[PDB]
Each structure stands twice: as structure tokens, then as C-alpha cells.
């Protein structure tokens, strides 16, 4: 069906972000506009970064 949504992550990095420097983690499922999975991290310093799925540190986070 018709999707008015595009892929948000123009850039992506595997950089580990420690828990205490994060405000929000949002997982954006595949399809619905973007064919790949998106993980948007809102840091406390106000910078917003994208981490790719199946990356060493976020892979264990998917369990819960």
C-alpha cells in the first residue's frame, strides 16, 4: 500500500554510545517506506545519530 514515508537516516555510524549519554533509542522497523531497519539515538548533547542493525553493541539490546 501507499507510503508517504521515506528513509530518515542519511548517515550511519557503528560508534558505541554509552547508556548514560542517551535520552532516547527508537527502532524503526523495515518496510513502511524504508526497506532497511533504522536505529535513531537521541544523545543528551542534542546530537541525533543513526546506528545500523546487527552491530556488536545494539545486537544484544534487541533481546528485550
Amino acid at each position, epitope marked *: 500500500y501507499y507510503t508517504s514515508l521515506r528513509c530518515r537516516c542519511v548517515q550511519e555510524s557503528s560508534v558505541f554510545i554509552p547508556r*548514560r549519554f542517551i535520552d532516547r*533509542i527508537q527502532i524503526l522497523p523495515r518496510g513502511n517506506g524504508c526497506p532497511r531497519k533504522e536505529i535513531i539515538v537521541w544523545k543528551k548533547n542534542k546530537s541525533i545519530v543513526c546506528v545500523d542493525p546487527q552491530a556488536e553493541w545494539i545486537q544484544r539490546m534487541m533481546e528485550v
Partner: antibody
Amino acid sequence: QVQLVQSGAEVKKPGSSVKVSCKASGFSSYAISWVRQAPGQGLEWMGGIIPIFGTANYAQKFQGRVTITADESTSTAYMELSSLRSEDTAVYYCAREPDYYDSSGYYPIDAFDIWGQGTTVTVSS
Amino acid sequence: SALTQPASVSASPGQSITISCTGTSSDVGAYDWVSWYQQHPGKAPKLLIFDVNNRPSGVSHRFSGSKSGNTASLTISGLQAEDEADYYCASATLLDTYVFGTGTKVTVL
């Protein structure tokens, strides 16, 4: 309503190593820190562990002595304090750094919501 | 080092009191990651405030938190006898650690 149960009060010699356990009631272990409390004194953060992020960090004055481990199968966090001395006589607490999770996302909390009962450590003297 | 708080505060009942917590740019002045704790003698601490002003469920709204620069504060409105306790502020640091305040003994006369 989840609570943290720590190991009983131990009496050890100077130079020895004390391992204090901290179990979470449920099913899996979360972010756990360790806070020392000397008699009549203030609270002192020694270190912590994030089993979810696979990281453990300690305070400069406790670095090289204290060892924090977490077993996700038995949901137990450990506090290993090597080369004990007189000033180490304190009440040792384990505390959880809570995490919030919903449809909008994962929100970590940089605070200590639930605490353990406390493990009194007395050194000889 | 540690977060600076007065050793003790004395006040009459039903009177609001503010407890200061002075840190540095690497902790209190970095982000809103500042917490407050009530500790009754011999008992494990109880989280009163998380973030700067956020109270968890079950905590009275008489306890309110604030922050401006390197200084954080805890206001206890309509002070009761049961409020008689020790109060610690805490803050996470840029070193990926936590730092506790010296502690404030509150007394009701």
C-alpha cells in the same frame, strides 16, 4: 515492586578479597551500580555495570581493586573488592539504574530507583 | 571530588526549605542527569527526584527539584517531622561515572 537481595555481612582480614552478590527478583539482570557508605559519612559511588551494553566502569579511587561481574543466567551482580584495609569498613549497597521502554522507544534513567538492603563489611583491627 | 551541600538545615514545621547541591560543568552543569535521595538513619536511600524535577510514583509533590548552571536544589514544601532525614544529590559525569553530594541533615524544631 522488584527488589535487590544482597549477600550477608562478612568479617574479613586486611589484604583479603570480599565478593558481595546482588540478585534481582523475577527474570533477567539490569544496569547495576555499587555504592559504599562509611559509618556516619556520605554516599560513595564505587562503580557500575550495564549487562545490556556489555560495559563496566569504576571510580578512579576504586579502579584496580574493585571488580563487577554480571551473570544473565542466574541474574546476580557481584562486587569483588581486593586488598582490603581499615578504611574499607563500610556498608556496601547495590542499586539499579532503571530503563523505561514503550512503543515510542527506549529511555534510560540516570538515577537509582531501587536499592539493596546493604552488606556491612567490617575489617580487622 | 564530591558535590557540595550544607551539612545540615534546621527549620520550623510547615515551612518550606531549599537544599543546594553545587557541582561542576563535568557533572551538575553538563546535563539534567541530577537525582535526589532521602535516607532515614540506618535505612537504604529512597529516590525522590530523577532528571531535574521528575518525581517517581508514590513520592509527595512537596519534594520539588530545580537546576541552574552548576547548582541543583531540592525544595521540601510544608516540612513535616517525618521529613527529618539526610538528603543526597547525585549526578552522572562526563567521565561515565556518578558523583554523590556530601549530604544534608534536615531537622525540625
